[PDB]
Design a protein around this ligand. Structure first.
Ligand SMILES: Cc1nc2ccccn2c1C(=O)NCC(C)C
Ligand SMILES: *[C@@H]1O[C@H](CO)[C@@H](O)[C@H](O)[C@H]1NC(C)=O
Length: 352
């Protein structure tokens, strides 16, 4: 079990002003630290944030959090479940900011909600440096769904924070799971009039202004004022990053299909789905550390049976182990694994 600590700096808060926090399981004999960002959609105006507060309140508030959580998948301490990093120091950071981990705004006379995701990550790192992170050799910032996009937005800022604090020997790396989206042509189209009809490009542009959202500096300098939404798309922000980042992405991700307004398949939809897989494969062609199976699914790294899926005969825990070796090509230890077959479940190891 990982145990809850609420932040000592209580100005760093969840949406409703309650303190944010982290769950920790130490491993005294290890210099490896895994910090995992939870996912769970987002909200971008008063009315949809109000709805989320009634029926998704654990993603907006720490008031009802349990004192412990069990580590699963890459956060498990058992080698049977986690062949990759079972002996590491484990941290689970709950997502209670509803801002894709980008926000830098407090609740105030003008703001009903606080959007503090970017500041939550920096404050967790700061408090952990007094609980053993100061001795680290490797800090892996990982995350799923909105947390995977959060890795892309925040990994270089963690690297800069640790350098400025006097720890240039800690190697900062990222692992982004199910956070690599395309701003592609949708299968059916609606103008952005409400929550359900608003495509991601439009919803994120509004969200950035509502959250006071922040993006990595080199990407911000490329796209400039009013165009920061582009940095929430992995294939546009990734080439701007300096930290090593491993990208895990299903080729037919359920969340991508949802934002494309896709739910007996006829010719138009068949060609749409095949073109999506091809476009995703294209964006990953020159990403050297990546795992992209031809399955219809969503998230993987904290699933207990994450060991089962394989690309070209290599599992995800093996690929991440090969990545670690590459950062000390390797015979029989590949790091770039992207399926070529063109339809969901053409890989027999896909989740049922
Ligand atoms: C962050 C997220 N969670 C979910 C869950 C279901 C459907 C979509 N999303 C999204 C989404 O639209 N990201 C686009 C962009 C930020 C890369
Ligand atoms: C608490 O967090 C806020 C927001 O990041 C920061 O401005 C402030 O300096 C922090 N306070 C302390 C004592 O670290």
């Amino acid at each position: 079990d990982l145990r809850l600590h609420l932040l000592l700096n209580t100005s760093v808060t969840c949406n409703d002003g309650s303190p944010a926090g982290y769950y920790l399981k130490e491993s005294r004999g290890s210099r490896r630290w895994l910090l995992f960002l939870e996912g769970g959609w987002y909200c971008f105006n008063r009315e949809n944030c109000d709805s989320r507060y009634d029926t998704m309140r654990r993603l907006m508030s720490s008031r009802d959090w349990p004192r412990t959580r069990t580590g699963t998948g890459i956060l498990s301490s058992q080698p049977e479940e986690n062949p990759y990093w079972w002996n590491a120091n484990m941290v689970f950071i709950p997502y209670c900011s509803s801002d894709v981990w980008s926000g830098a705004s407090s609740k105030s006379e003008k703001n009903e909600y606080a959007f503090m995701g970017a500041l939550i990550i920096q404050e967790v790192v700061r408090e952990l440096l007094g609980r053993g992170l100061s001795g680290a050799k490797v800090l892996l910032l990982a995350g799923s769904s909105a947390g995977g996009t959060g890795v892309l937005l925040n990994v270089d800022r963690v690297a800069e924070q640790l350098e400025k604090l006097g720890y240039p020997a800690i190697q900062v790396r990222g692992l982004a799971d199910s956070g690599w989206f395309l701003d592609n042509k949708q299968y059916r189209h609606t103008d952005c009039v409400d929550t359900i009809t608003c495509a991601p490009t439009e919803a994120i542009r509004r969200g950035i202004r509502y959250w006071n959202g922040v993006v990595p500096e080199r990407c911000r300098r490329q796209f400039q004022e009013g165009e920061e939404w582009n940095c929430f798309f992995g294939y546009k922000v990734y080439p701007t990053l300096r930290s090593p980042v491993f990208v895990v992405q299903w080729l037919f991700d359920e969340a991508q299909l949802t934002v494309d307004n896709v739910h007996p398949v006829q010719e138009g939809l068949r060609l749409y789905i095949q073109n999506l897989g091809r476009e995703l494969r294209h964006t990953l062609k020159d990403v050297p550390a990546s795992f992209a199976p031809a399955c219809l699914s969503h998230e993987i790294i904290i699933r207990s049976h994450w060991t089962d899926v394989q690309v070209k005969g290599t599992s995800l825990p093996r690929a991440l182990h090969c990545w670690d070796r590459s950062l000390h090509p390797l015979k029989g230890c590949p790091v770039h694994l992207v399926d070529s077959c063109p339809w969901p479940h053409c890989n027999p190891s896909c989740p049922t």
